[PDB]
Each structure stands twice: as structure tokens, then as C-alpha cells.
Design a protein around this ligand. Structure first.
Ligand SMILES: [Zn+2]
Ligand SMILES: [Zn+2]
Ligand SMILES: [Zn+2]
Ligand SMILES: [Zn+2]
Ligand SMILES: [Zn+2]
Ligand SMILES: [Zn+2]
Lengths: 610, 610, 610
């Protein structure tokens, strides 16, 4: 009854109380454009974009100094009075500010593009209540490999439906020139943190256009039914196919994706520590280049119920450390019959420098007995004895239960691998001598003639058995061994006047299987199997001095001293009658080849040269 | 004196000016529930939850279309007039919205659970001024390994006091059925970014229930006096104990934690690049399974003043690359006397495929001379000569100063390791031939009879010394070597009519210790140590052709040509009188074993076959 | 015309309507300090700091309980009426709250310091529209290695211009005592996420003071023309130079930086997976310590058009896995002529335990033919035959096209490496026997005398050719081999009464080059090259039993049985007439050295002992 309208009250600014009250009633963008500020620099809150679009709200301040900026329908809203309202924001741009459909019904790429332009490429898609749909490539601003920008595409749980045969994210400067042979790239991008990229699986969905996006860190994202995380099919620069360059795919959750990388060539590629579940294909870089892949690392990934993890071309400097493979039987795996393909395979070039360490190749039952299956398939270049240029791959400490871990005969060095249900011999690969319980030893010892020369018999070597006797078990002590005793006959000043080499064979055996009366002493029998010496050769062309034949039909004798054995040769006559004087010593470089296999578990025979 | 009450002024909405003014006085949640909106879709700001609870404030809009939603005391607040007020938020849920005690006095798990339910598992705990206490497991929504969700538990520095024997975070669908043998799991979780999990050290605190949380990335968090980051004790599926599956613990700050992982079985486990200070235990997965651990990687960790870093059972495909151990002497280390335990140890099964690369085992003074200490303790399965199934672990490029790096006699392949203050021999392990300065060479050369056959003497091999002479130092030149000359006698069309092998021993020596008159030429003396040839064997059952004895008591002669040496055998008579014709050449596959040890620093003798 | 001033309307709080209206007109900090709250606990919005400073706005509530807190010009603003206004914030502190110049014109370090103090070291710099300049070190609060804090320096794209010779970020407790020899450190820091650190390149810019900041994760940042990411030059504790401790530099974008790390000593250093473009220097830790670096890992980095990647001192437990080097020719590289320098070089100590796996050393054209260039330069300690203490570095699976991959003669173990355009021999390094197509085999077989003794001829070994015949290609079958047959003569209860060893040489050859009439059978010829046996040695000192000479001038014969070959020795007489009885069997531990080189691509000869 007692009612005074607020329009009859005047605020000190000159505007009515009704106009002051109206600044708390700004629900939509249209309400702001129809609102006139009461003071200069006023900040008001707009609730949402429209009555149907519940996102896009925020604070807007009337920039009284700006009378020319255009309305962009997101961060600069121009009122009917001409007031330039500008959104207050110091973080990442939200495509919802510009009207991106958070229900996933319509293509929001144009609105995502608007958020890219005002944020210098730093876009954030919000929480899990939002689901966006992008069907048009969005271009990131141009930033060279040495540029001053850092771009990010991230979120707080939102979902992005992807519809693109080439990549919903690319370089802005390639838009309109998508098929250009020029390097229209942009670099330095973090993408995926807090984002769920998803495809429907019945159409093409590519997230990153690898033709145009270099130096990319893809981490922390979920990818579901995505045809390819990265794709590149555009020839440019020195390449006749598309290629990817400096892409790191790490710590993601991949599921039901057709490919991780889809291209023909790669530079500095990393795909490590990703949880991949039921993916139909991994890293495909199977072009015919020399090489196709310049460095790839695939470490600590999970690859379960999946297809071919990597179908690669020629690979230089490849590493695959600690991957987890379990029950993979889909995608191209039933046809290629391998988890990894390297060069050369078919038209592909030869690989060079690839190392597999600590992988588990847990096979589905179908490939345990498939004679045409190998975990890693390739052809090495072995027609020449020299392997300098095209180094075949090596395998260290891996575990498989498949028919084969690699193509038979294509690997030269491998140790520590496990072939559960199969055998190493089937791979036609060399076995390291260590796994045959063969160990090598060596020593250098000087035998002065004044001490080790009696009646033409010269001591040439000394071995010890004291550590053999120290072993606890009788069955560990015995061993056999070869000896290469390189003898250099020298004067007092170490001038070499002669040279020879002896080949000796040994057997070491003590008490074995004996309780009462057993001893720790172990005995050696030696036999001179070979001998050769130089009988000539000018070593001093000024004074006419030649290497001297010091031994005349030598015979080997050994003598036990304590626990040691002195090996000696007969028929010794020292050189003399020259500028350098007489031979004062025999300097012996002894190298032993010990065969440790005995009745016990000894892997290294403890005989050694002193 | 001149006072008109605001209740006598009417706003265009129909409500009084006093009611318009009241929308700026909403301090607590009770003020909002007692407030009636002036327009439809009005957004007002609530300052805090109550007069005592200073958090939980935010913007709320009157959803005029909603007349049925229930009050949840956090994001949907229903007023006395029936207005459904809904919080404006597009980011992560804050448990403080629902009343989580930010002082750490009362259990806030129920409020954390409320934030989980409305955020699809994306909870954020705020800044370092907050300290929460959780004593009841909070369950994350169900998401399979191929599910469409990505969940996160993160913060901006807040602290969470943990009180749980099983894990404050688990799967929601396991709540009420915690002891179920079914796989009531949920997957895809990022946890720890910007969060400080802390226990009091006098009670049980577990962060992640590994029985129910799979595909977990634990990164960026601080953990202080936490009994276990991950624990799993519930048997399920094919396992008779609890197990962890696809857990990655990376880039965290661990201090005074009792265990990193506490279970008996593991699948696809990663614990890398964590700063661990004074932790009493690391990765414990020491069940009796075959195996206990299916792939584990522990790389680049810091482990100082700590206990046993890893007490594991049987491990398949294990890798430990580049860890940093320094002065560890607490926890179970004084009893187990090792930094890492592998299978087999006690009841545990045998390991297969484990590689240690580039670790530093910096011991406390107590374990440098402890004969019962080894950095890595295990028992290998060496009763058979074949090591295909149970591949013993290998060690490459590690550094220790402890008594032992591994259990004596249990390692077959190891190179590049450093045993400061100790010795390699004490490990009873084979020494690679490369470390004994032994190098291998090989060549294939054809010696046509028309060129290399004079009076029954046939040239069979050719070695060169030109690169020996090229060496700068005299002491590097000399060497000795063995020769395996596999000779295949072939016709013009490369039909093999005979086969033999010669064993040759060589010594190479030139000027050494000589100034005036020295020459670069080095001389070779050879000796035929062994010879054998095939004298029969049907190779053509249709025409009745057998392998022919080409040599009759051969004698070895050598001839110096330039810098090369031609090795020749006598008593040669070519095969003839058959369908294939006469022997036209000797095709020699020469393999050399070079013993490089001399008076200099030569590690590879530069004699080689041509 | 009909105008009632708002000052004549009274709100229920007792304040006039004009004062109520004024709470929506608070543009600057001065407007808030001049504003009096209408109710207790009122929250008002301040638009910005001043009319010229457009940042720093936010919500402030009148804390009626606080009458003593001082104004800090950022989060606590005290009004003229004495009202303590406190900013509502539960996230990271913004230096703009305190007036940090977002245009980069003036030093904002004092304002950054204010944000550190109120956030417990959790500072956030905002979006790419901001560019700050810091010229004074900002100190982080004290937190020990076992402390309860987690600190972060991050942003949302902002740029920070860096001007500091020591580090714009350091420990607070070192300020004023910067040259102290005490360990005035603080630990647990995440720095760089969403931040662009930039220098002008004509002055000193260091981001992290490594003398005072330990346990640092530097990830996700862009660094442009920064003199050093980490620098440490202050001697302290047991060190005579500065050092870095537990610094991880991972997943960054480095460009045109002078150094990554600039110091003389390091502990637990990680520099992995960084995109480095045109950087003039990497990890410099080249002090004379023993060692200089306690564990360093540099994995998966990009290093293009850059300088020396790592000039290190003595390194213990170093790893370099999978780096990508391409066309580096600037910085110190033209003078040092290497990509990596290790100890010893010059005054630097010797390294021990360093492994290079899977790197690509892609050289600029200038270093392909430079005889003074090597990818990794160092001097190994090879004056002694024993390499236990100072283990030389090893190289596995790397790829280079430079003149050398390492300093000649300084590497002992290396395999799988590629030397495009060069050769392995030039490195003066041993070649693993596997690359020479040499493979080892072994077996243990018991030959009971009742079965394998006829007329003094005793079967001592059995080899099989069945798998040789199984090979598809004729050229793959043939091979030669050595045999070490360790024979232990035992009684029925396995008491060793004798021991001997035979050296045998073999040649295996079948049909080769033959179509019609060819057979799969392959034939063996054996020759006894060496033999030795023990003829004495007390094994039972109680009963006076010695090892017995079982063989009297033995002659080797072989017999083909199916596909097997039985090797036999003559002159056998069993021991007898003692407490243990007679010799009942010959237990043979056979170890074979197979030389697989033939006319085909065989790398492992398929002869084996049974
Ligand atoms: Zn409206
Ligand atoms: Zn962002
Ligand atoms: Zn109240
Ligand atoms: Zn979040
Ligand atoms: Zn003003
Ligand atoms: Zn933060």
C-alpha cells in the first residue's frame, strides 16, 4: 500500500535506484548489452550466456577508455550504449564463454578457436559435466621451435568428442593451405591434462595433426575409441611421406584406439608409461625411408588384449625398456603375427641400433605354438661379416612364452632372456660365453732371469689355487682352463729382444665326495698344447739387431709351491752380444679361458694367474 | 532524522528495496535458505557455510525450473520458500562445500564422499592453509579398464591426515563388500598432485586401496609418515593373496613412510623418480607366486637413510635403472642385510629376466665389511646347464662399495660394474672376455687354386699387420692370437667337395723400447696347433659322390707380403673325376681369438684376417 | 524532477541506502579502505588495485573479530574505520594481489616474496597476458628433506623475465647469509608448470639457486635465453665447490639457454625428456672431485643445433639412454670437439660405471671426418689389468655417423652400436664374440663304464647333428668347433678317483650347392688336439688314496650313431683297490666353442653336446 518505486530514488552517481538495482539482475548476455553502467569501471556479474545456455557467466567491467573494440561474444561484449564490457579473467580461456555446446550436439570448433585466439593458445574445457564435439580443425598460433610461447590444451575432466580425419588440433597457419609442402608448423604444446578425448569408433577421430604440431607433450589424458592420437600424411621438406617430429606420449589412459601414431616417418618419438587397454594398434611408422624412425623409445607401457604395438620401418637408435604385454590377439596381430615389426620387413629398410630390455611378452594361447609368430619381427643385414653400419637389435633380460621372441637368425647378441615353454636354441642366436659358465682371467708378471732360470729351465707363469681351496663345497672347486702365455723377453731397461706364446691346458681337481680324510688342497696337471716364437725380424735398423730365438724345443714342467703352480719351459738361452745387452727377464702377459662346468653349481672357476 | 525505511521502496520485480538489499547480506548457508529470490535465475553470493565455518562460500543461482531436487548441503541448497539454489561451478569439487573440517579435528570422509559423487570422481582439497582428516574409506565411482571416465584426487597444497588400515580411497562398489573375492575395482585415477598425505606414525595410514584401484598414476604428492601408499590384502580372481595391478608411483616426495607398496603380488608396477628420505621400506611384493611380480620397474629413485628398497618375490621382466642409494641402515635392512630381495629367497619362487643398470649402491659403513650383506639378495636356479626358463639377473654399469653387490655365484652375466673397496672375484661370477682384453675377428676370403696353389702348397688365409704398424705407441702393437680357419673346397660353381679346419697360434712383435733405429714393421710367427679334415661322407646319393680328403699330412708355412702374411698348407691334391668337376678354390671362413694383453694399454689387438 | 536522494533511505542494518549502493562501486583498493561495512562479515568485490593497476581484484570479507592484523597490501587490507578486510582465496597466491608489475618494467620480486609468505610457498603467476620481471632472489620457506611442506612455483602461461647471477628462487633462510658454508637449504619444490622463464641473452639469468634448493622437480616449463636453469657456486659441508643435490629437469622446452645446470658437483641428478633447441650448453658438472657426479641420468632428450650436452667430471653410476642428437655445432663443442665429456679429462678424476644405450649421435658435417672428434670424450684408467674400482663406460645399441663415438682405446665392452660412415675398428675396442658368429654350448653326461667301455676304449662325449640337418638352407649347416671335455672318473657313489680334460677340434659339412642327390646328413671329423690328466694328489689323508691315472696315451676315435657322434678315448684302465671301490663311470662336463662362420648367413652353429 505504501509503495515508492525505486525509480524515484537517485543514487549519488546520478542514476536511479532502479538502475542500481538492475546491476544484480543481469542473467544473460543480452541483459548486459542492454545495461548501462552506473559508474566508470563498474564490475557486474552476468549469470550465463542466454536463458537456454547456462554456462559462460562471469565478471565484466566497463572499460570507459575503450570506445572502439568489437564485440567478440565471449570476452568483449559491447552494449547498446557503446560500453565495452570486458571479462575479468587471468587464467585459461573457457570455450563456453563464446558459446561452445557443452552437450556435444553441435560442432563447437569455432568457439574453441575463439578461446585459442584470446588466450595465446591456452584453452581449458572444464569439468566432467561437459561434453564437447569438435568436427573442424582448430589452429594454434605460430610459435617456432625457438619461439617464446608455451601452449596448453587441458581441462578438469571434460569430454571432447572428436570428428576429424586429419586432427582437430593443428597449426593455424596451415589452415587454408593444408596440403602445403612447406613446414607450416607450430611448436611447444601440452595437451591432454584433465581431458577425455573420445570417438564413436564408426568414424574418423584424430586429436593431434602431427604434420603441423611439433614438440608435443601428450600426458594425463583419456582416449577412448580414437582412430589416432597423432596422424601425419602430408609430404614436406625432405620427406616423400608425412612424418611426426618430437612427440612424447606419456602417462595416458588409452582404450579401444585404432592407432597411437599413424604415419610413415618419425623423429624423436616417445611413447612410454601409458595404460593401453584393448587398443587395435600402437605406433605405426612403417615407411620405406633410410631410416623411417630417427630414435624411438617405448618404455613401461601396458599393452593388454590389444593388437600390434609397433609396426615400424627402419629404426635407428630404438629402445624398448620394460613394456608389459599380455594376451594380445586383435588388430593386425593375427595377420602380421608379431607384437613389434621392425625394418627390414618387406619393402622397409634395415634397422640399426635397437635394444630390448626387460619386456614381458605374455602371449595369448594362440601364439605359444605358432611357428610363424615372433614377438619382434625383422630381417637383419647379415650377408657381410661386418655389422658396423646396420647393427642388428639386441635383447637383454626379456621374458616371453611365445614360440619366438624374434625372427630366427636375425639377432647376434642376447643374454638374460627367458623363453618359457620354448627354448633359446630355436632362435638360431649365439649364446654368450658367460651362460656357458666360461670365465676369462688375465695377469702380467715379471720373471727376472736371475730368479727363475735354472739349467735352461725358465719359469714363465704362476697360477694360484688358494681361492679354489677356500670354497666351501667340494663340488664347486674343480675346473679346467686354457692358458695363453704371451712372453716378452726384455733387457734390464725393458728392451724387447724376443717374443713367444705358449698354449697350455689345465685340469684342477681335489677331494670330491669324500668325508673322512678329505683335504682342501686341489691339484693341477698342465700340458703344453702349442708353442711358437719369433726367430727373426729387424728391430733396430741402425745397429742391425733382430728378435732372438730364446727357446730351443721347449718342454713344459710345473711345480707346486704352497698353493701356487709355477709353469716353466726348457731350452732357454738368453739373447746377448748387442747394443742393448742381455735378456734380463721374461715378461709374461697371461690370459686364461676357464671352463667352470663341473659336478657342482660353479659358474666361474677360481683358478687365476698371479 | 529524515529516515525512510528501505522496506517502503518497491523494486520493479515487485519485491521491496529491503529485500533487494538483503541479497548482499547472505553470509551463511542459513541466510540463503531463508532468502527469497527477487527475480528468476538470480545469482547471489553466499559468504561461507556458517558463522563458525569460514569455507564453502560461492555463487548460487535460483533454478526456477527445479522444484524437486533435494538439499545436499553443498551444491543444491533448498530454501524455506522451496527455491532450489544451485552452486555455480565448472571445475573440481571442493569437500569444503559440504562441510569438510579444514582443521583436521573430525573425520571429513563423508564430506569428501559427497564431493566425489557430484564431480564424477574429481576432488580438489585446496591450499596449504587447510588440513583434513580422513578415517573412513571413500569410494570412487565404477569405471572399467575400458571405461569413459578420468578421475583425479588433487589439491593446491592442502594436507590430508590419513587414518586407515586398508586405504582411504577405494572403489565405491566394494563398500559393504570389502572382503569380496570378486573384482570390484575401478580404474583410471590420477592422485596426489598438490596434496600432502600425512600420518602420525603411531597408527595405520594407507592412501590407496590397491585391491580395488587399478590403473593409478600417483604423481606430484608429498607423503609423510604414511604406513603404505598402496596396500592390497584381499584374495580375488586367480590369486590366493591380495595384489596390485597397473600402479605407477612417480615424481613424489616420500619421507618416513613404512612402505611404498604393501602386498604379496603385482602386475605392471612402476616406482620411479621419487625423492624418498628416511623411509623404512619400499616395494614389498614377496608372495610365493610363480611369479609374484609380472613386470616391475624402479628407475631413478632417491633412497637415502632408508630401509629395504624392495623385498620382492619371483620377478619376471624386472628392471632397476639408475637408482641412487646412500647410507641405508634402518627398517628391515639390518635383518635382511640387503637393499633389494628377489626370488628365490626362502619360500619364494625363482625370478626370470631382471636387469640392473647404472645404480649406485652407496652403503653405510656397517655393510662395507659385512660378509653376509649383498645389495641384491636372491637364489638362482643353476642346477641345470640350461637357463632358458629361469634367466638369472644381470648387472651392467652399477657402482657399489658394499661387501657384495649380489649373492655370490647367483649371477652369470655382468660387466661394467664397480666394486669400490671390494673386488669382482668375491661374487663368484664369470668375467666377460672383453674385460680380459680379448677381442674376436673374422673374415671370408676365396683362394682360387690357379693363384694360390704351387707344388702342393695351398694358401689358406691372409692376415694383415698394417693397422698394428699404424698405432702411435710401440707398447700398443704386440699381441697374440688364435686362428680357426674353416676351409671349404669348392668347384667353380661353388659345389663343396671337401672341408677342413686348421688351428693356428700367432705372436706379433716389433720394435719396443727402442729409440734410434726403431721400425714400424711388426713380425708374425705362426704354428699349426691342430688340423682335421673330413675324408668321406655321401653328398650326392644319385651319382655317388663323397667329400674328398684334399690334404695329406699338411705342414703350415707363412710368407710376408708387404704388411700381410699368407698362411699356407702343404700336401694339397684337388678332388676331381666326378660330375661336378675339380676343386677350383679354397673358401676360408677365418675366425680369430686375439689376446691383446701386452706391455701397453692395448685392449684390442689390431691383427685381423683379410 | 521527482528525485529523492538515496542517502535519505535507511537500510535495516542502520546504514543509508547510499552506503548500501556504495558496496557495488568499489573499483580500487583505496575505495575499500575508505568503505565501511554495512553488516558484520560482509563480502564485497574490489575491482582492481588502482585506476592504473587493473589486476589484484577479488572478494574481501570484513573480519569483525580481527582488530589487530596489519595491512599487507594484498590479502589483509585495513580500512580507515579499522575494519580488517581479508581476501577470500583457497588456491594459490597471485603476486598481482600485492602489485607485481604484469608489464615487466619494474622488479616485482618483493611482491612475489609477499605471495610466497602467505601461501607457504605456493605461487601462481597467471595467464600469458602477463609478463613479470624478477631481479632480486625470492626465498622459499624452510622445509627439510623430511619436512611437512610441498611448495610450487607455477602459472597459467605467464612470462617471467629473469635477472639474477645466482638464482631468482632460493631458500629464504640463506637471504642475508648467501655465502654461508652452512647447509641453509630448503626442499620439496615443483617449479615451471605453465610458466615461461625468459632472459634477454645479454645479461645473467638463473632460475633456481641449486646451492639452496634441493629435491626440485622442474617440469612443464619454457626456458628461453636463460643463462642457467640451475646454478650452484657456494662451497659448503664436505665440498670445496658448489653442488646440486636431487634436481630433476624433465619435460621442459629449452631454447637458446647457455647452460641447463652450471656447477662443479652433483648428487642424484636427472635431465630427461626435454626439447632443447639451439642451447649453447647442457649439464656442466666438471669439478675435480672423486667423484664429481654421484648418479646422473640423461634420457630421451632432444639436443639439436646445440653445444656440448654434458661436460662432466668423474661420474659414478651414470646412464644416458635414448637421447636424440642432431647437427650440434656451437657453444663449446667446436673447442672440446665432443657432445659429452666425462672423467677423466684434464684435471678431472676417473669415472666408474657409465652406460650409453640407444642414443643417436647425428653429427653436423664438420665432425664426420674430424679425427679429433668423439661423441663421448674421456680417459679410462687402464694401466692395471684389474678394472674393479674404475669401471670404464660401455656402449650398447647406439648410432653415430661421426668420426668416433668415444675416445679410442678407452672402452672395453660395447656391442650393437652403429658407425655409419666410419668403422668400429677405429675405436680400438674389443669386439664381442657374438658379433664374430661365435657361440658357446655345454652339457653334462654320465658314461657308465658298463655301457661305454670296450677293450680299453671309453666313450667320453656325445654330440648331435640332428638340428643341423633340420635347417632349411644348405649354406647354414656347416660349422667348426672346439671341445673342452672335462672328465671326472667316479665310483658308483660319485667319489672322484681321477680327472682329465681333452681338447678336440671338429669340422661339420654336408651337401652344399647340390640339387639332385643331396642329403640332409652332415658329417663330423674330430681330432684330439690336447690332453692332460692328473696322475697323483692325495684326496683321502686317512686311508692314503690319491687321484689315479686312468688313461695311458689315449687315442681319439669317433663313431656315428643315427645323427649323433660318440667321441671315445683309448688306453683306459679303471682305478680300483681302495676303500671307495672301482671307477664306475666317466662324468664329462663338455663345453664347446662353435665357430659358425660359413658360406651362409649362419650366426650360431647348431652342433651341440648331449
Ligand atoms: Zn531475462
Ligand atoms: Zn591452463
Ligand atoms: Zn548472520
Ligand atoms: Zn581437478
Ligand atoms: Zn574511483
Ligand atoms: Zn598451485
Amino acid at each position: 500500500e505504501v509503495k515508492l518505486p525505486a525509480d524515484l530514488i537517485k543514487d549519488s552517481s546520478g542514476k536511479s535506484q532502479q538502475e542500481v538495482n538492475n546491476s544484480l539482475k543481469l542473467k544473460t548476455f543480452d541483459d548486459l548489452r542492454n545495461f548501462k553502467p552506473i559508474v566508470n569501471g563498474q564490475t557486474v556479474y552476468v549469470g550465463q550466456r542466454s536463458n537456454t545456455y547456462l554456462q559462460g557467466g562471469g565478471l565484466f567491467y566497463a572499460d570507459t577508455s575503450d570506445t572502439t573494440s568489437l564485440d567478440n561474444d565471449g570476452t568483449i561484449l559491447v552494449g547498446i550504449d557503446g560500453t565495452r564490457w570486458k571479462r575479468k579473467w587471468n587464467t585459461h580461456a573457457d570455450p563456453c564463454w563464446f558459446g561452445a555446446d557443452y552437450t556435444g550436439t553441435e560442432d563447437c570448433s569455432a568457439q574453441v578457436q575463439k578461446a585459442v585466439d584470446v588466450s595465446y593458445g591456452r584453452v581449458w574445457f572444464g569439468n566432467a559435466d561437459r561434453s564437447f564435439k569438435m568436427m573442424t580443425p582448430v589452429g594454434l598460433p605460430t610459435n617456432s621451435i625457438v619461439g617464446d610461447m608455451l601452449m596448453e590444451i587441458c581441462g578438469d575432466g571434460a569430454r571432447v568428442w572428436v570428428y576429424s580425419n586429419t586432427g582437430i588440433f593443428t597449426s593455424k597457419r596451415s589452415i587454408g593451405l593444408e596440403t602445403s609442402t612447406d613446414d607450416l608448423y607450430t611448436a611447444a604444446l601440452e595437451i591432454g591434462r584433465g581431458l577425455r578425448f573420445q570417438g564413436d569408433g564408426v568414424s574418423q577421430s584424430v586429436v593431434v595433426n602431427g604434420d603441423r604440431l611439433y614438440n608435443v607433450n601428450m600426458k594425463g589424458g583419456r582416449y577412448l575409441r580414437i582412430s589416432a592420437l597423432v596422424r601425419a600424411t602430408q609430404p614436406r621438406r625432405n620427406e616423400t611421406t608425412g612424418y611426426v617430429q618430437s612427440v612424447t606420449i606419456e602417462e595416458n589412459h588409452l582404450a579401444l584406439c585404432n592407432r597411437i601414431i599413424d604415419s610413415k616417418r618419425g623423429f624423436n618419438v616417445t611413447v612410454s608409461r601409458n595404460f593401453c587397454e584393448s587398443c587395435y594398434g600402437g605406433v605405426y611408422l612403417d615407411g620405406d625411408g633410410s631410416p623411417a624412425v630417427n630414435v624411438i623409445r617405448c618404455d613401461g607401457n601396458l599393452w593388454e588384449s590389444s593388437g600390434v604395438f609397433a609396426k615400424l620401418g627402419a629404426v635407428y637408435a630404438g629402445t624398448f625398456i620394460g613394456n608389459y604385454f599380455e594376451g594380445n590377439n586383435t588388430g593386425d596381430l593375427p595377420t602380421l603375427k608379431c607384437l613389434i615389426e621392425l625394418g627390414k620387413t618387406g619393402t622397409t629398410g634395415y634397422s640399426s641400433g635397437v635394444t630390448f630390455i626387460g619386456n614381458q611378452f605374455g602371449a595369448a594361447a594362440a601364439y605359444k605354438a605358432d611357428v610363424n609368430y615372433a614377438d619382434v619381427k625383422f630381417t637383419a643385414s647379415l650377408s657381410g661379416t661386418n655389422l658396423d653400419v646396420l647393427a642388428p637389435p639386441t635383447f637383454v633380460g626379456n621374458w616371453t612364452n611365445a614360440y619366438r621372441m624374434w625372427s630366427e637368425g636375425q639377432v647376434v647378441t642376447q643374454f638374460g632372456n627367458a623363453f618359457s615353454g620354448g627354448n633359446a636354441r630355436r632362435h638360431q642366436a649365439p649364446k654368450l660365453h658367460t651362460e656357458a659358465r666360461v670365465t676369462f682371467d688375465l695377469s702380467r708378471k715379471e720373471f727376472l732371469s736371475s730368479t727363475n732360470l735354472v739349467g735352461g729351465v725358465h719359469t714363465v707363469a704362476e697360477i694360484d689355487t688358494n681361492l679354489i681351496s677356500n670354497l666351501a663345497s667340494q663340488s664347486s672347486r674343480a675346473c679346467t682352463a686354457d692358458m695363453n702365455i704371451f712372453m716378452q723377453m726384455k733387457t734390464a731397461s725393458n728392451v724387447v729382444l724376443g717374443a713367444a706364446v705358449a698354449k697350455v691346458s689345465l685340469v684342477v681337481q681335489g677331494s670330491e665326495g669324500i668325508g673322512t680324510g678329505a683335504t682342501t688342497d686341489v691339484y693341477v696337471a698342465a700340458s703344453l698344447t702349442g708353442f711358437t716364437q719369433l726367430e727373426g725380424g729387424v728391430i733396430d735398423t741402425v745397429n742391425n739387431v733382430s728378435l732372438f730365438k730364446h727357446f730351443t724345443s721347449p718342454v713344459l714342467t710345473i711345480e707346486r709351491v704352497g698353493t701356487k703352480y709355477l709353469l716353466k719351459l726348457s731350452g732357454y738361452v738368453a739373447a746377448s752380444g748387442s747394443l742393448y745387452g742381455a735378456t734380463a727377464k721374461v715378461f709374461s702377459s697371461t690370459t686364461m679361458t676357464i671352463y667352470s662346468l663341473n659336478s657342482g653349481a660353479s659358474v666361474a672357476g677360481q683358478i687365476y694367474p698371479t
